[PDB]
């Protein structure tokens, strides 16, 4: 957590100064640690996404409809 907090405090400054979002290599070498850990932190950080979110622009569809049970069986395979 505190690594993330540190990192974001840094990147704010980096996008002050560069007029841009920063590159992982740049703020990593400023943060004194290799790109792999940064990249994994970024892979890990974001939260879940609320099954009942309306992918439908209106209430025509929820997200929980358009997935599949890719675990169970198949009848032709049983035969």
């Amino acid at each position: 957590i505190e690594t993330i907090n540190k990192l974001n405090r840094i990147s704010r400054q980096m996008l002050q100064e560069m007029g841009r979002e920063p590159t992982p290599e740049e703020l990593a070498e400023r943060m004194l640690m290799p790109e792999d850990k940064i990249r994994k932190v970024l892979k890990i950080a974001k939260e879940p996404i609320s099954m009942e979110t309306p992918i439908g622009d209106d209430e025509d569809s929820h997200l929980g409809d358009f997935i599949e049970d890719t675990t169970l069986e198949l009848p032709l395979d049983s035969a």
Partner: protein, 603 residues
């Protein structure tokens, strides 16, 4: 659960649980300290409030939203309303072994049949094929069979044609109002990707070939296909159970040719002569020697019986047109010529079918109607039948009439300026005079559209019905109404403000003269209200429909005779005008309460 991008989705319910736990055990921290009861109290409050949020969030008061700036789902919300489990996944179901597509017209059909694209039924009837392929020994097992399907050899198509035989189908138009929104058919198949479909049943669907599409299901097992072959098949369903009339009215082209064929003109040729039978009549029409509409004395055979169902051979002569003689050539042996010396508008053809049903029943009736459709299309084609600018008629007495109405309204304008009549008086006057003026114009034009044919033909001048297309459309009953044809030639009466309130100065022109901006501008809001309230009759319809059914979902017959005593009396409805419904016809189909008899008593 993840998706492919790696992100986990989360049922918001999880949140509702997790917070609960922590507070509980947080309380057990403070309880293990015997801290002041104040913190204890507010934590109890929080717990109660959280359970409330779990069980129904939008109920107690302050509604919880999550990160999304959106409220969360309690448990109840999976049970409430339309999104709940009942009418979303316990009654309104998704189904396997189905499909859908666009519809189109099969006119060469027999109405117990239907059109069908190949590949649809191919994949639908797939495991059937796998099984009998194993049975025949071409594909030893399933993988090989599936590959051969993907390979598409002629043996596959042959086997398809084998399996479709006897194997029925079932359709569904969207939406389903009355139970004849789905009928069982038999498959016949087309090198296309749309469905051909017999025309007459469109009215039972109310479907218009303007981009509609419909759905296909299949009776897998045995009893299913029995019920389909017995009950929802169209031949077993011709009369509405709401009212004992047919739903096999032939609509608008068939009837047109039938009218054109049976007609009492005189113009062409062959008048005043004789034949021995209808066959040489159609013969000589194909040779180009006499019209269909041409009146003639000929031979006729016919049959009857009030016997013990034993027909009464009969033969004589009749004055008649030719086309009526041809049209005799298909009636199945129980109906006289008296049916067919008319010009055959809609009500006739309906009555013909009703007669064939009462006197014979089902098979001969359907055979008859199918031949009706055939012959009607075929002879309407031979017509030549079109529309143009000159078929529309402008009565020359359309300008002066306007001028006198103009002068009248000017008169009463000066009168109300003097201040003698009132606003409502002026108003009533003006509306009455313009309405009568439109009546006068409609009179003129219909008197110059219907029977103006002065065709000298072994006479000097005889008046007969007009050969113009749109009047034949009108009197036939297929499409059109005197108001509408008035509205093509005459001016459009008057139209009102969207309040129900209404205008002073009416319209004064038609289409063929060409509207002007204001008149079109004014017709706008009328049309808008029309399609507007058309849009949403259906909400109320469906809603009260659910109410109706879920009252009466449960009842059923269980018994023949209750053994009880009398109930109701029924009497006619003769008040307000003449009779509107007989005692005779409403009691029809009912039973008798009691010993009754006739005013000649003891009968």
């Amino acid at each position: 659960v993840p998706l492919d991008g790696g992100r986990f989705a989360t049922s918001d319910l999880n949140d509702l649980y997790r917070r609960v736990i922590n507070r509980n055990n947080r309380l057990k921290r403070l309880l293990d300290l015997a801290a002041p009861d104040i913190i204890v109290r507010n934590e109890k409050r929080m717990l109660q409030e959280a359970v409330d949020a779990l069980l129904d969030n939008g109920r107690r008061g302050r509604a919880i939203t999550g990160s999304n700036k959106r409220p969360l789902k309690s448990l109840a919300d999976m049970i409430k309303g339309k999104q709940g489990r009942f009418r979303q996944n316990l009654l309104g179901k998704r189904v396997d072994y189905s499909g859908r597509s666009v519809i189109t017209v099969g006119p060469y059909l027999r109405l117990h049949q239907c059109g069908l694209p190949k590949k649809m039924a191919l994949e639908l009837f797939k495991p059937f094929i796998y099984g009998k392929l194993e049975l025949r020994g071409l594909a030893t097992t399933i993988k090989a069979a599936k590959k051969m399907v993907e390979r598409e050899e002629a043996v596959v198509w042959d086997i398809l044609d084998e399996v479709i035989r006897e194997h029925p189908v079932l359709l569904n138009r969207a939406p389903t109002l009355h139970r004849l929104g789905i009928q069982a058919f038999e498959p016949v198949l087309i090198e296309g990707k749309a469905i051909q479909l017999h025309p007459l049943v469109c009215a039972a669907y109310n479907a218009d070939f303007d981009g509609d599409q419909m759905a296909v299901h299949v009776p897998l097992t045995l009893e299913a296909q029995l019920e389909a072959r017995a009950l929802m098949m169209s031949t077993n369903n011709i009369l509405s159970p709401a009212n004992g009339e047919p739903i096999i009215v032939p609509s608008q082209d068939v009837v047109l040719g039938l009218y054109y064929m049976t007609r009492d003109c005189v113009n062409a040729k062959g008048e005043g002569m004789v034949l021995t039978g209808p066959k040489e009549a159609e013969r000589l029409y194909r040779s180009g020697l006499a019209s269909l509409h041409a009146r003639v004395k000929v031979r006729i055979t016919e049959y009857e019986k009030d016997a013990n169902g034993e027909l009464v051979a009969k033969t004589s002569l009749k004055d008649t047109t030719v086309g009526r003689a041809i049209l005799w050539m298909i009636v199945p042996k129980g109906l006289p010529y008296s049916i067919v010396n008319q010009a055959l508008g809609k009500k006739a053809i309906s009555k013909m079918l009703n007669t064939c049903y009462r006197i014979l029943g089902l098979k001969p009736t359907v055979i008859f109607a199918d031949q009706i459709m055939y012959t009607g299309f075929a002879y309407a084609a031979r017509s030549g039948a079109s529309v143009g600018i000159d078929d529309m008629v402008i009565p020359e007495k359309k300008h002066e009439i306007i001028s006198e109405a103009e002068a009248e309204v000017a008169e009463i304008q000066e009168q109300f300026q003097s201040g003698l009549v009132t606003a409502g008086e002026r108003y009533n006057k003006v509306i009455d005079i313009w309405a009568a003026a439109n009546d006068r114009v409609s009179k003129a034009m219909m008197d110059n559209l219907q029977t103006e044919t002065v065709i000298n033909r072994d006479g000097q001048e005889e008046k007969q019905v007009s050969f113009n297309s749109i009047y034949m459309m009108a009197d036939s009953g297929a499409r059109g109404s005197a108001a509408q044809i008035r509205q093509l030639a005459g001016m459009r009466g008057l139209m009102a403000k969207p309040d129900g309130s209404i205008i002073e100065t009416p319209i004064t022109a038609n289409f063929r003269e060409g509207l002007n901006v204001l008149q079109y501008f004014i017709s706008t809001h009328g049309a808008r209200k029309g399609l507007a309230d058309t849009a949403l009759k259906t909400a109320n319809s469906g809603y009260l429909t659910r109410r109706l059914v879920d009252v009466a979902q449960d009842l059923v017959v269980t018994e023949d005779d209750c053994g009880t005593h009398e109930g109701i009396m029924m009497t006619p409805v003769i008040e307000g005008g003449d009779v509107k419904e007989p005692l005779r016809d409403r009691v029809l189909g009912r039973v008798t309460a009691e010993d009754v008899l006739k005013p000649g008593t003891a009968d």
